[PDB]
Amino acid sequence: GSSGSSGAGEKPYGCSECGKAFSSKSYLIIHMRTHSGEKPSGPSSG
Ligand SMILES: [Zn+2]
């Protein structure tokens, strides 16, 4: 079967943080909004 590259060239707008593609740059940005942060770690001490 197939594993890896898509075939017809991957999309230029593909999130790496989680792994989500989008058929619209602007869209990707909106998605990245829930990825960027201010700390290198994820404190969940409530
Ligand atoms: Zn993402």
Swiss-Prot record:
Q: What induces it?
A: Down-regulated during erythroid differentiation by GATA1. Down-regulated by HTLV-1 Tax through the CREB/ATF pathway. Up-regulated by the regulator of nonsense transcript UPF1. Up-regulated by the cyclic AMP-dependent transcription factor ATF4.
Purpose of the protein: Involved in the regulation of antiviral interferon signaling. During viral infection, recruits SETD4 to TBK1, leading to TBK1 monomethylation, which is critical for the assembly of TBK1 complex and IRF3 signaling.
Q: What is the protein name stated in its UniProt record?
A: Zinc finger protein 268
**What stretches pass through the bilayer?**
none
Q: Which residues of the full protein are shown?
A: 775 to 807 of 947
Domain text: The KRAB domain functions to reinforce the nuclear localization of isoform 1 in addition to its transcription repression activity.
* Family the entry assigns: Belongs to the krueppel C2H2-type zinc-finger protein family.
Q: Quaternary form?
A: Interacts (via the KRAB domain) with TRIM28 (via the RBCC domain); the interaction increases ZNF268 nuclear localization activity. Isoform 2 interacts with CHUK and IKBKB; the interaction is further increased in a TNF-alpha-dependent manner. Forms a ternary complex with TBK1 and SETD4; the interaction between SETD4 and TBK1 is ZNF268-dependent and leads to TBK1 monomethylation.
- Tissue expression as described in the entry: Overexpressed in ovarian cancer tissues compared to normal ovarian tissues. Isoform 1 and isoform 2 are expressed in squamous epithelium tissues. Isoform 2 is overexpressed in squamous cervical cancer (at protein level). Expressed in blood cells. Isoform 1 is expressed in pancreas, lung, skeletal muscle, heart, placenta, liver, kidney and brain. Isoform 2 expressed in chronic lymphocytic leukemia (CLL) and several tumor cell lines. Isoform 3 is expressed in several tumor cells. Isoform 5 is expressed in fetal liver and several tumor cells.
ZnF segments: C2H2-type: 13-35
Q: Where in the cell is it found?
A: Cytoplasm
